[PDB]
Amino acid sequence: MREVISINVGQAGCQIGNACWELYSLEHGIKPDGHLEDGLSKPKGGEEGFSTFFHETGYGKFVPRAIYVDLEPNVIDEVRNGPYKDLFHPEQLISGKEDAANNYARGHYTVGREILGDVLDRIRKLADQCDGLQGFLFTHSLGGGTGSGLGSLLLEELSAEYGKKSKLEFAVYPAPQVSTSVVEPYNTVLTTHTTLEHADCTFMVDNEAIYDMCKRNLDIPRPSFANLNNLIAQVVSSVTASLRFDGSLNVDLNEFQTNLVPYPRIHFPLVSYSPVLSKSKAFHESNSVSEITNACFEPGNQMVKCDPRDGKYMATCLLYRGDVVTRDVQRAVEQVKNKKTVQLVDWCPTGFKIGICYEPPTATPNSQLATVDRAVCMLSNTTSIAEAWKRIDRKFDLMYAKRAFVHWYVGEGMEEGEFTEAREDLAALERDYIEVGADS
Amino acid sequence: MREVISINVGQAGCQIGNACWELYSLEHGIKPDGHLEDGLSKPKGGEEGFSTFFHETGYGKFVPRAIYVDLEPNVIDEVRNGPYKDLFHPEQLISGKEDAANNYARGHYTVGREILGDVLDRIRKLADQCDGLQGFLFTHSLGGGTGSGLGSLLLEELSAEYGKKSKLEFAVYPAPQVSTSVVEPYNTVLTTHTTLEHADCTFMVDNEAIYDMCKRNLDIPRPSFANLNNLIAQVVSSVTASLRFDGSLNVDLNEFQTNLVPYPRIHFPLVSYSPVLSKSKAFHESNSVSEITNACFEPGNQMVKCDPRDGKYMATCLLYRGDVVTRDVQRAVEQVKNKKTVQLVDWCPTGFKIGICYEPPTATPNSQLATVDRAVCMLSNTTSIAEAWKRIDRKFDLMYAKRAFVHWYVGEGMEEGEFTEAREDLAALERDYIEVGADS
Amino acid sequence: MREIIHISTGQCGNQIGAAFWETICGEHGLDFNGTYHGHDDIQKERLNVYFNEASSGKWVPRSINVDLEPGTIDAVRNSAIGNLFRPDNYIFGQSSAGNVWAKGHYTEGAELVDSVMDVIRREAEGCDSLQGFQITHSLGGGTGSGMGTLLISKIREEFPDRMMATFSVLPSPKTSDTVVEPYNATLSVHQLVEHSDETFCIDNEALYDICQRTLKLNQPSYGDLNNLVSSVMSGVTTSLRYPGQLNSDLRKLAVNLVPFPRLHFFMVGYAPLTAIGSQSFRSLTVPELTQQMFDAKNMMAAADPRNGRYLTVAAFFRGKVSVKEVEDEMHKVQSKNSDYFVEWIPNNVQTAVCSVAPQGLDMAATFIANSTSIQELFKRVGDQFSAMFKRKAFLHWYTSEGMDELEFSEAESNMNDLVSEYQQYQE
């Protein structure tokens, strides 16, 4: 339970993985060469971390255990040009000459299943090299159907392979307003059922919310995909803060599994991070921890295009960085309960988990961040997720009415039966989620 | 009795022997010219070698006792151009005036024994010069029919001469897809006949698997015969390191011979060596010997077109060179017992002939594999060679039914009964391996 | 057995041997006055193979030049390479055979065959490592097709063990000036099938086509065609002479390139064949030469892959080439040309590589195949014979010669038997 395997699938997934590895290097002060980087600490690695993501070698050079898979050679060449490839092993990465399809047709097809055995034996060899395992981390965008199908195939193969560690999947969601890809809703809906069958826990993040945040909080005129990558890297690092750096209240992955799954089928947590702001305003403004807890409930920090007030509260967790006073956060959570911002349920209500980590948050130079000694990462289970599901499903059905494209999918690897089945599965999931949220 | 005599037959055999002597001189810090350079230098004397293969003259010169026999004057000129001819004695190398045939039909004929008489009196004179002998070493190829024929005939003659010393014959096996000579199936069958006459131990190796390894593991665009000869030099050096250098587990060659043959008849064990990787990849990896053992069990590190995962397990030997930890080999045998992939025979099951050599492995600079401080060589018996022989026998039977070259053969001095008996011997060996696999 | 003898006869085979020696002295680099210029050790060995260590380090190539006209030896003496020769190396008689094979090998051939056989016996006594006998003559001309045929017969009678490399030139069907040309050609081959064991199909019209498509020459000139055939002949002998990854010998082909001894004909192909001035655009690669070899337009025999079924094929290469590339190319061509590639082999391949780079090129390749299109040329020449001697025109000449028509029917029936052998083995 000391190692976590991270997988980078698709173009956006590979970029996010690159950003997370760069941020992990920056937190521990790791340079492209390293050898640890360098050997003086304790707790920059060793000891753990790095012992959860970076593989320890006989020479001491920490190899970040990452598997970059994509059938687009340009992205693979790009990620090979950087020093990250030197950090990784040349055999860990997988290359493809011709992209699967646009986008989910071949990504889930048997052509995408041909490399399944290759990557499976790669993962088996990597596990044989290391010692112990806590879970499987996944990084693929639900917008990219290629990455979606490939990640679902890997998740199914890992569930059929080990089934002993919690399968984590970080999914990127497109903007509900505009969609550049016309089959993007089809790919996402078809992938939802696969992730329901395979994933033990999910992560839903919206690009449009990230862009609104960086335009508003960081006060930037021009958003960039690199800024989104940096923000998601900060998020992912905030998730595994206790596993990398020791804190006053070290939290476990199994604790996340217990808190986020209080029912037979509840594995959809929403992410919120605060305080996030421009570094200049961070130098100008100094808020309290209660203000940060309140901003955690704002619609912007939730990284979703849904209002959290209509959502119904469920079991949530809050990770804290740097120095954090227990009595202060107790007072803050009591004040929050007194506010009754999000409507509470009858099962969970006393469901605010608190975890503290000594590692203070780090601000990347590319993307601004509120420079503060203590950060707050809230993983909630509000019922706005059902709202996003219905929002995308309405457009999915409006399309599938005429669907304008079904010939390609039914000829390549699919059929209208599979589309109808995925639609019914999404509808049943929405109905069950609304039911479990409304019975309180 | 400690001395070992090596024989170089055919063009490929002479090239292989050249590479072997090159690596030998490179390991003991000896230049390819002579006098010295240098030593007999800590511990290049006792324990021998270099006095087992490198007979020391009165002035300290270490001459390798090798006989380069080939009826092709081009190969003789080639081996004379090198400085090892100056290192060799002119009487050691045997020049061929004219090639017997293309390539085996006359090599194994009376024209072969005409020069075999000369080489046998030369071998007798050499044995009178250097007393003691541990085993007869042979290097030839099945592609060069002259080499195979002369080597088989000389092996039969010397086994009829002494028969008390072991016989180690290295034979290069052709790929089942490419046939540089359409005469090679007949030659291989008639050579299997001669092995049925006398075979203490024979090593099977396919150039196809080695070239694939150079393309993949060594990252070579077009693998050269020189790289193959260097890899063969490396594997044979690892084999003979148990007698050359000191080690906690030093195993006699006759001990290997008897361990490989628990049954009344076993002649053909397959070989495998690890690690064989790129120089930069060797700088990127610092694995222990356990991973080297796990990789050697795979069909990739076999250097032959045979899958050990397919065939059943039999008595095998694991040699290790360099720094070895008892805990490492115990963990390795634990993981092997945990594998439970190949079927074990009833007599052997917990059988792994463990050999240890304190001398670290050494690789040539021309070879793309970086020199490693640790190496594992697995030599096992498998029934996949029976399948390869069956394919070769199908091809040879098709050609025999077409009787096109049987006319040229009976013109050369061959008979129908001879080829019939060779086919019967090949089928008998295949059925024997089938049965000893079925006895498991 | 590295030493190989060369014999040159006929009206055009003399120029063929002249160009062959030109290419020989150009490969390693040699002066036309017998002055050694190669470096360092191999070139002396190839001299001992082909030349003779005369006085003062001189070198004279071992060649037997014979023809009914001394103007031919005068013309080849006018050339730089080949100007000097021992008078015993060449004997020339008078005057002409009238383009008649029967008269050629009966009267014009018998009066000098004694002297030339004595000469060649002397040189065979001088050359201990003799293995093969390259032959350069013309099958079209009755003079050459008779004289060279008689000489090959006498050598086969004298040296049955030594190889016989026959690079004769088949007649062109377009030429209709002399109708006795294909008749003399078929009468010569009817005996050369037993007199010679290694023959190579060479059509004048194929040479004209290849020089008009690649060299784009306005009028066919024997000079460039002789240069090309000399390059092809020098490649196959340097494959063994010059060091390589795999050398090829005449015995190797006699035991591998041919399944049954009744077959002696070997198609020809050369690469690279670059147009004049386009050498800058061309880049020497394996796939382009592989494509060139399996095209009838690049062959000079010239047999059609699409027409004739392949019995066996062989491709020799020079310069630095990788075994993996040629193996992949052979696998691809076996997968795509499985229709022509016969099933009873089933995989026909014979490879040889020369390490050193070709003269003026980085890599050069030759190709030989045994296809069922040569029997088509046999049918053509038989139909020519029948339709020509059905008119009984000019047959009075051969009645005066003394030959019988029963022998002619026997020759044509033996050619039809060879066709049927190439139909066993059906097309």
Spatial strand order of the sheet with B201-206 comes to B94-95, B66-70, B5-9, B135-141, B166-173, B201-206, B270-274, B374-380, B316-322, B352-357
Size of interface A-B (CB pairs under 8 A): 17
Across the interface, whether the CB atoms of C243 and B74 are under 8 A apart is answered yes
DSSP, collapsed to helix, strand or coil, labels residue A367 as coil
Q: What is the DSSP letter of B302?
A: G
- Asked if C111 and C229 sit in the same domain, the reply is yes
Please give the tally of structural domains in chain C: 3
Residue with tokens 């045939």: B101
Instruction: Give the pair of three-digit tokens for residue A100.
Output: 């699967």
Question: What CATH number does residue C297 fall under?
Answer: 3.30.1330.20
DSSP bridge partners of C299: C269
Q: How many helices (H) and strands (E) does chain A have?
A: 18, 12
Cβ neighbours, 10 Å, residue B209: 19
Q: Is there a contact between C378 and C417 (Cβ–Cβ < 8 Å)?
A: no
Q: Is B101 on the interface with C (CB under 8 A)?
A: yes
Pairing of strands C365-371, C310-318: antiparallel
Across the interface, whether the CB atoms of C255 and B211 are under 8 A apart is answered no
Across the interface, whether the CB atoms of B287 and A58 are under 8 A apart is answered yes
What single string gives the DSSP state of each residue in A408-421?
HHHHHT--HHHHHH
In our burial notation (b when 16+ CB lie closer than 10 A, e otherwise), range C158-180 reads: ebeebbbbbbbbbbbeeeeebbb
Q: Is there a contact between A376 and A355 (Cβ–Cβ < 8 Å)?
A: no
Cα separation, C224 vs C207, whole angstroms = 9
Q: Which of B209, B158, B160, B217 is nearest to B9 (CA)?
A: B158
Q: Is there a contact between B367 and B417 (Cβ–Cβ < 8 Å)?
A: no
CA distances from B128 to B88, B119, B122, B132, B339 (A): 17, 14, 10, 9, 51
DSSP, collapsed to helix, strand or coil, labels residue B297 as coil
Across the interface, whether the CB atoms of B98 and C1 are under 8 A apart is answered yes
Q: Which residue of B has its CA nearest to C257?
A: B182
In our burial notation (b when 16+ CB lie closer than 10 A, e otherwise), range C242-263 reads: bbbbbbbbbbbbbbbbbbeeeb
- Asked if C345 and C417 sit in the same domain, the reply is no
Cα separation, B115 vs C273, whole angstroms = 46
- Asked if C224 and C123 sit in the same domain, the reply is yes
Q: Which residue type, as a one-letter code, is found at position C2?
A: R
Q: Is there a contact between C266 and B116 (Cβ–Cβ < 8 Å)?
A: no
Q: Which of A431, A434, A433 is nearest to A423 (CA)?
A: A431
Catalytic residue among A255, A291, A418, A430: A255
Q: For B238, phi and psi rounded to 5 degrees?
A: -65, -35
Pairing of strands B374-380, B316-322: antiparallel
Binding residues of B: 11, 72, 141, 145-146, 180, 207, 229
DSSP bridge partners of C130: C3
Across the interface, whether the CB atoms of C259 and B405 are under 8 A apart is answered yes
- Asked if C354 and C383 sit in the same domain, the reply is no
Q: Is there a contact between A10 and A141 (Cβ–Cβ < 8 Å)?
A: yes
CATH 3.30.565.10 given to domain B270-384:
no
- Asked if C127 and C247 sit in the same domain, the reply is yes
- Asked if C224 and C264 sit in the same domain, the reply is no
Q: Which residue of C has its CA nearest to B214?
A: C324
Cα separation, B206 vs B304, whole angstroms = 5
Q: Is there a contact between C232 and C239 (Cβ–Cβ < 8 Å)?
A: no
In our burial notation (b when 16+ CB lie closer than 10 A, e otherwise), range C29-44 reads: ebeeebebebeeebbb
Architecture of the domain delimited by B385-438: Orthogonal Bundle (1.10)
Question: What CATH number does residue C109 fall under?
Answer: 3.40.50.1440
H helix intervals, A240-351? 241-244, 253-260, 279-284, 289-296, 326-339
DSSP, collapsed to helix, strand or coil, labels residue A228 as helix
Q: For B7, phi and psi rounded to 5 degrees?
A: -125, 140
Q: Which of A57, A90, A128 sits opposite B286 (nearest CB)?
A: A57
CA distance C304 to chain B (A): 24
Those residues with Cβ within 8 angstroms of residue A36's Cβ, 6 or more apart along the chain or in another chain: A30, A44, A45, A46, A50, A60, A61, A62
Those residues with Cβ within 8 angstroms of residue B208's Cβ, 6 or more apart along the chain or in another chain: B175, B177, B178, B305
CA distance C235 to chain B (A): 18
Q: Which of A285, A342, A305 is nearest to A213 (CA)?
A: A305
Helix, strand, coil content of chain C in percent (nearest 5) = 45, 15, 40
Most B CBs within 10 Å, among A35, A85, A124, A125, to test the B interface = A125
Q: Give the sign of the dihedral formed by CA C44, CA C48, CA C51, CA C52.
A: positive
Cα separation, B273 vs B303, whole angstroms = 8
Q: Is there a contact between A171 and A140 (Cβ–Cβ < 8 Å)?
A: yes
Q: Which of A90, A128, A129 sits opposite B284 (nearest CB)?
A: A90
Q: Which of A191, A163, A231, A178 is nearest to A10 (CA)?
A: A191
Binding residues of A for Mg(2+): 72
Q: What residues does each domain of chain A span? A: 1-269, 270-384, 385-438
User: Which fold does the domain A1-269 belong to in CATH?
Assistant: Rossmann fold (3.40.50)
SS (H, E, C) B355-421: EEECCCCCCCCCCCCCCCCEEEEEEECCCHHHHHHHHHHHHHHHHHHHCHHHHHHHHHCCCHHHHHH
Cα separation, B439 vs B105, whole angstroms = 38
Pairing of strands A316-320, A376-380: antiparallel
Residue with tokens 């193969």: A157
Most C CBs within 10 Å, among B14, B98, B179, B394, to test the C interface = B179
Binding residues of B for GTP: 11, 72, 141, 145-146, 180, 207, 229
Chains C and A touch (3+ CB pairs under 8 A): no
| Set of chain A residues whose Cβ sits within 8 Å of the Cβ of B299 | none
- Asked if C224 and C91 sit in the same domain, the reply is yes
Binding residues of A: 11, 72, 141, 145-146, 180, 207, 229
CA distances from B385 to A88, A154, B174, B305 (A): 38, 36, 13, 9
Q: Is B181 on the interface with C (CB under 8 A)?
A: yes
* CA C238-C243-C249 angle, 5° bins: 50
What single string gives the DSSP state of each residue in B17-70?
HHHHHHHHHHHTT--SS-S-SS-S-SSSSSSSSSSSSEEE-TTS-EEE-EEEEE
| Set of chain B residues whose Cβ sits within 8 Å of the Cβ of C1 | 98
Q: Which residue of B has its CA nearest to C345?
A: B399
CA distance B193 to chain C (A): 22
Q: What is the number of residues in chain B?
A: 440
Q: Which contiguous run of DSSP H or E holds residue B169?
A: strand B166-173
Pairing of strands B66-70, B94-95: parallel
Chains C and B touch (3+ CB pairs under 8 A): yes
What single string gives the DSSP state of each residue in C380-395?
HHHHHHHHHTTTT-SH
Cα separation, B79 vs B93, whole angstroms = 9
- Asked if C269 and C254 sit in the same domain, the reply is no
Give the domain range for residue C8.
1-259
Q: What is the DSSP letter of A312?
A: B
Terminal-to-terminal C-alpha distance of chain B: 37
Hey, what long-range contacts does A90-93 have (CB within 8 A, 24 or more apart)?
A90/B281, A90/B284, A91/A122, A91/B281, A92/A65, A92/A66, A92/A67, A92/A68, A92/A122, A92/A126, A93/A66, A93/A67, A93/A68, A93/A69
Tell me the Ramachandran region of residue A372: left when phi exceeds 0, alpha when psi lies from -120 to 50, beta otherwise.
Answer: beta
Spatial strand order of the sheet with C310-318 comes to C269-271, C365-371, C310-318, C351-354
Q: Is B358 on the interface with C (CB under 8 A)?
A: no
DSSP bridge partners of A169: A138, A202
Question: What CATH number does residue C395 fall under?
Answer: 1.10.287.600
Residue with tokens 């707050």: A376
Catalytic residue list of B: 255
Q: Which of C1, C260, C349 sits opposite B179 (nearest CB)?
A: C349
CA distance B49 to chain A (A): 32
Across the interface, whether the CB atoms of A57 and B285 are under 8 A apart is answered yes
Q: Which of B288, B294, B335 sits opposite A58 (nearest CB)?
A: B288
Q: Which residue of C has its CA nearest to B102?
A: C252
Q: Is B109 on the interface with C (CB under 8 A)?
A: no
Instruction: Give the pair of three-digit tokens for residue A258.
Output: 């217990």
Cα separation, C138 vs C148, whole angstroms = 8
DSSP bridge partners of B371: none
Q: Is B398 on the interface with C (CB under 8 A)?
A: yes
Q: At what angle do helices C222-241 and C13-28 cross, to 10 degrees?
A: 50
Q: Is there a contact between A429 and A192 (Cβ–Cβ < 8 Å)?
A: yes
Pairing of strands C198-200, C265-266: parallel
C interface with B, Cβ–Cβ below 8 Å: 1-2, 243, 245-247, 249, 251-252, 255-256, 259-261, 322-325, 327, 330-331, 344-351
Chains B and A touch (3+ CB pairs under 8 A): yes
Q: Give the sign of the dihedral formed by CA A349, CA A355, CA A360, CA A362.
A: negative
Binding residues of A for GTP: 11, 72, 141, 145-146, 180, 207, 229
Question: How far from the centroid of its chain's Cα atoms is residue A178's Cα?
Answer: 22
CA distances from A212 to A208, A215, A223 (A): 6, 5, 9
Q: Which residue type, as a one-letter code, is found at position C249?
A: D
Across the interface, whether the CB atoms of B211 and C322 are under 8 A apart is answered no
| Set of chain A residues whose Cβ sits within 8 Å of the Cβ of B285 | 57, 89
- Asked if C235 and C357 sit in the same domain, the reply is no
DSSP bridge partners of B376: B274, B320
Instruction: Give the pair of three-digit tokens for residue A179.
Output: 């969609």
- Asked if C361 and C282 sit in the same domain, the reply is yes
Spatial strand order of the sheet with A201-206 comes to A94-95, A66-70, A4-9, A135-141, A166-173, A201-206, A270-274, A376-380, A316-320, A352-356
Q: Is B14 on the interface with C (CB under 8 A)?
A: no
Identify the experimental approach: cryo-EM
The angstrom resolution of this structure is 8.2
Cα separation, A422 vs A183, whole angstroms = 14
Q: Which of C246, C247, C260 sits opposite B180 (nearest CB)?
A: C246
